[PDB]
Amino acid sequence: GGNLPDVASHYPVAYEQTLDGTVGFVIDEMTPERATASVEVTDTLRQRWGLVHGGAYCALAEMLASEATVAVVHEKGMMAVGQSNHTSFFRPVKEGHVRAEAVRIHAGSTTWFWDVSLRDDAGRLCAVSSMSIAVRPRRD
Amino acid sequence: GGNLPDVASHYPVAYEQTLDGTVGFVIDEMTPERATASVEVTDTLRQRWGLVHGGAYCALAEMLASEATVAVVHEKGMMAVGQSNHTSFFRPVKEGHVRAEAVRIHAGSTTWFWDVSLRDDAGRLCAVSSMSIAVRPRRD
Amino acid sequence: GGNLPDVASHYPVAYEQTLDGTVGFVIDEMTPERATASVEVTDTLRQRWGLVHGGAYCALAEMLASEATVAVVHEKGMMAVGQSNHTSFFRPVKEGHVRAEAVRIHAGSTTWFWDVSLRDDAGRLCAVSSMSIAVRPRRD
Amino acid sequence: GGNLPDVASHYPVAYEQTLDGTVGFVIDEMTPERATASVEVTDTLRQRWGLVHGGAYCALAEMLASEATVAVVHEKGMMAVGQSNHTSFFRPVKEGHVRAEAVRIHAGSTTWFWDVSLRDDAGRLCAVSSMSIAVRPRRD
Ligand SMILES: CC(C)(COP(=O)(O)OP(=O)(O)OC[C@H]1O[C@@H](n2cnc3c(N)ncnc32)[C@H](O)[C@@H]1OP(=O)(O)O)[C@@H](O)C(=O)NCCC(=O)NCCSCC(=O)c1ccc(O)cc1
Ligand SMILES: CC(C)(COP(=O)(O)OP(=O)(O)OC[C@H]1O[C@@H](n2cnc3c(N)ncnc32)[C@H](O)[C@@H]1OP(=O)(O)O)[C@@H](O)C(=O)NCCC(=O)NCCSCC(=O)c1ccc(O)cc1
Ligand SMILES: CC(C)(COP(=O)(O)OP(=O)(O)OC[C@H]1O[C@@H](n2cnc3c(N)ncnc32)[C@H](O)[C@@H]1OP(=O)(O)O)[C@@H](O)C(=O)NCCC(=O)NCCSCC(=O)c1ccc(O)cc1
Numbered sequence: 001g002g003n004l005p006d007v008a009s010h011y012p013v014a015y016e017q018t019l020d021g022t023v024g025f026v027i028d029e030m031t032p033e034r035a036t037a038s039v040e041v042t043d044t045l046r047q048r049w050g051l052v053h054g055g056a057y058c059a060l061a062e063m064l065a066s067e068a069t070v071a072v073v074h075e076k077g078m079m080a081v082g083q084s085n086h087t088s089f090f091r092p093v094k095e096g097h098v099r100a101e102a103v104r105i106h107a108g109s110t111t112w113f114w115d116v117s118l119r120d121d122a123g124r125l126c127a128v129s130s131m132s133i134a135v136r137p138r139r140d
Numbered sequence: 141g142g143n144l145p146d147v148a149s150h151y152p153v154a155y156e157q158t159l160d161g162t163v164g165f166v167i168d169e170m171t172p173e174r175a176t177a178s179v180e181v182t183d184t185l186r187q188r189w190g191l192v193h194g195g196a197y198c199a200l201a202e203m204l205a206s207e208a209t210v211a212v213v214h215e216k217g218m219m220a221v222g223q224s225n226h227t228s229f230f231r232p233v234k235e236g237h238v239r240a241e242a243v244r245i246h247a248g249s250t251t252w253f254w255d256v257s258l259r260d261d262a263g264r265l266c267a268v269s270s271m272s273i274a275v276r277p278r279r280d
Numbered sequence: 281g282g283n284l285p286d287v288a289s290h291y292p293v294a295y296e297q298t299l300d301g302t303v304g305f306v307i308d309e310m311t312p313e314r315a316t317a318s319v320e321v322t323d324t325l326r327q328r329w330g331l332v333h334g335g336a337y338c339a340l341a342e343m344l345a346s347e348a349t350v351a352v353v354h355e356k357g358m359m360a361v362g363q364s365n366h367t368s369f370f371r372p373v374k375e376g377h378v379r380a381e382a383v384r385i386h387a388g389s390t391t392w393f394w395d396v397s398l399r400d401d402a403g404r405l406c407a408v409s410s411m412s413i414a415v416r417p418r419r420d
Numbered sequence: 421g422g423n424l425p426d427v428a429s430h431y432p433v434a435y436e437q438t439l440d441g442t443v444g445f446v447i448d449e450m451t452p453e454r455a456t457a458s459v460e461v462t463d464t465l466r467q468r469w470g471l472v473h474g475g476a477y478c479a480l481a482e483m484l485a486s487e488a489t490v491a492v493v494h495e496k497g498m499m500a501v502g503q504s505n506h507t508s509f510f511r512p513v514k515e516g517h518v519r520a521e522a523v524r525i526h527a528g529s530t531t532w533f534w535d536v537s538l539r540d541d542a543g544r545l546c547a548v549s550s551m552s553i554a555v556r557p558r559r560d
């Protein structure tokens with residue numbers, strides 16, 4: 001349901017059961033240099049004070065940047081996992097959607113790096129995340 | 141609830157409906173300088189490859205560091221929100237628990253900083269998060 | 281001098297004696313939303329293995345982001361200081377120049393955020409720095 | 421003059437000519453899990469406003485964490501370079517010394533991670549740096 005890249009015939013955990021399926025992350029565009037995703041804000045994404053949870057912006061950035069890397073590297077026999085996620089918070093989001101745009105800025109042999117912007121429905125920049133993704137040969 | 145600090149009579153979102161209650165975060169210890177929390181790994185905490193989601197370590201650190209700041213500052217008329225969350229991933233977790241310990245290292249008039257360590261059931265350091273928490277006068 | 285913003289009649293340390301003047305940082309462009317600076321690589325910018333010091337990219341980003349904030353806020357009675365500097369290193373520099381471009385992405389009442397790109401003489405992205413700048417009322 | 425680990429018979433750049441020798445960084449203790457260094461504050465370490473430059477704390481952290489890794493890995497045929505440096509600034513330093521303690525918290529096959537604390541002469545925690553060091557086989 002998430003439109004994550006189809007790079008394998010089966011996956012260990014079905015979309016609807018994962019963190020991402022639970023909060024409702026959906027990938028829209030996906031290219032080697034750029035990917036977008038969004039999510040409808042519901043309480044499941046919020047913390048008790050009624051704001052989108054800082055963790056939700058982190059998770060959306062993490063999935064989008066990792067999977068954008070997976071889309072390219074899996075068929076090359078590689079695995080891609082987050083090694084560093086630095087998200088900074090500029091404006092709270094209370095409702096509507098959060099919309100993430102990941103732009104690739106470095107693609108090394110061992111590390112890819114993506115800048116992710118997280119905007120609210122008015123287009124305001126509410127958070128950014130710098131994602132460093134480790135790329136390593138798959139163990140099996 | 142998740143045992144979050146009881147600082148107000150009403151909260152906008154019930155624990156069990158927040159991202160925190162959905163994934164199952166529970167605070168164990170809380171003092172002004174040090175707090176701990178933990179979560180059972182379930183699929184809701186995982187991504188589709190079967191590992192604990194990077195976002196889940198970030199969210200655990202974010203709630204713990206923030207709420208451990210709230211516990212001190214709420215009664216002083218202040219709000220505390222995540223301003224920066226830098227989480228780095230050293231070893232994946234596939235199953236069991238993730239346990240977090242937040243140690244406060246700076247308590248400034250406008251910013252508190254917490255180092256958070258995230259450990260598996262074997263005690264191994266799987267991730268760390270450097271949490272910066274903004275502390276502002278509460279709005280009407 | 282290094283062409284830093286001229287906002288005060290006296291400064292505690294002369295350009296040529298600061299770390300900035302010692303290594304040779306010079307600001308080229310400065311507007312409220314965007315600033316650029318550059319430095320010639322000399323041994324003073326290098327570490328003992330002959331590469332540009334990681335600290336040198338961090339210092340270039342720090343001075344540029346801070347002073348580009350000073351340029352706006354000093355006349356408003358505010359001081360601006362680095363609060364967080366996250367620099368990530370993609371490709372080393374052995375000789376030539378390092379050129380920095382800071383693009384402002386958030387200008388909040390208490391925090392400004394700048395994305396800084398650090399490029400070699402070939403235009404290649406060698407490092408980036410996410411600069412968070414605290415903005416406070418100036419003390420007597 | 422810096423007491424950096426002696427792991428090779430010659431180096432590309434002599435200590436006194438490097439950034440580190442110019443500002444005066446000196447390593448005191450050095451073990452596989454922990455290293456310390458300090459530097460006397462002089463104008464060469466300060467910015468124009470008379471404070472220690474944020475870049476100086478970054479550079480001290482960077483050299484100490486990289487070289488602490490070099491001390492162990494060079495004789496194993498590896499190179500160690502900074503891949504990420506995230507320094508956060510809690511209190512300015514105006515004079516005296518800055519004293520850095522690097523503690524190793526993860527030693528992977530490709531990445532080592534060090535927490536560095538930077539204290540003033542009164543022992544106050546003025547800055548911290550999270551250093552991720554890439555370890556790679558040497559090319560020659
Ligand atoms: C960190 C890393 C090695 C990781 O690689 P990656 O993201 O997968 O990128 P990739 O491996 O594709 O390589 C990119 C470039 O890195 C360099 N590189 C990568 N691997 C190696 C290697 N094994 N040996 C030598 N150079 C390498 C190389 O220049 C490469 O370009 P190319 O020749 O392959 O086209 C690479 O991004 C890099 O070298 N970044 C720059 C590191 C840097 O310059 N840090 C600052 C200086 S070192 C730290 C320091 O300040 C210090 C100060 C004082 C002191 O006493 C000691 C150290
Ligand atoms: C960033 C911040 C202002 C945030 O404040 P916080 O976390 O709420 O801490 P708090 O406000 O409790 O204050 C801690 C100490 O900071 C200083 N401080 C805080 N607010 C102020 C203020 N409004 N005015 C003057 N000093 C202040 C002061 O020393 C304070 O101690 P105390 O005198 O109150 O006991 C404070 O942590 C701080 O001052 N940190 C250090 C910033 C720093 O030194 N950065 C590096 C140098 S500035 C950046 C730079 O490298 C640069 C280079 C070249 C160039 O041309 C320009 C800039
Ligand atoms: C961090 C900070 C307060 C810093 O302020 P700044 O960079 O100077 O920005 P500025 O003060 O100009 O304000 C920007 C917007 O922030 C909000 N804000 C700023 N100051 C305040 C304040 N004193 N009171 C209420 N809202 C404020 C407000 O929306 C403001 O817009 P406006 O209404 O003034 O137009 C502001 O950037 C901000 O609010 N960012 C978002 C913080 C955020 O949403 N973090 C994640 C959620 S809180 C952390 C968390 O996940 C958590 C999870 C579970 C749990 O149990 C507890 C916490």
Ligand SMILES: CC(C)(COP(=O)(O)OP(=O)(O)OC[C@H]1O[C@@H](n2cnc3c(N)ncnc32)[C@H](O)[C@@H]1OP(=O)(O)O)[C@@H](O)C(=O)NCCC(=O)NCCSCC(=O)c1ccc(O)cc1
Nearest residue numbers: 063066081082136187193194229230231232528529530531
């Ligand atoms: C990042 C890195 C691979 C780099 O390695 P390092 O710092 O040199 O550490 P090292 O290579 O020594 O290995 C440490 C452990 O990492 C794992 N690992 C390392 N290399 C590999 C590999 N090639 N294949 C599988 N596992 C590996 C392995 O568990 C290893 O332990 P051991 O079996 O070797 O004893 C390793 O630190 C690591 O795996 N860290 C954890 C990564 C992580 O769990 N990130 C979060 C989950 S993935 C990102 C994400 O959230 C996501 C969400 C949704 C979605 O749709 C996609 C992704």
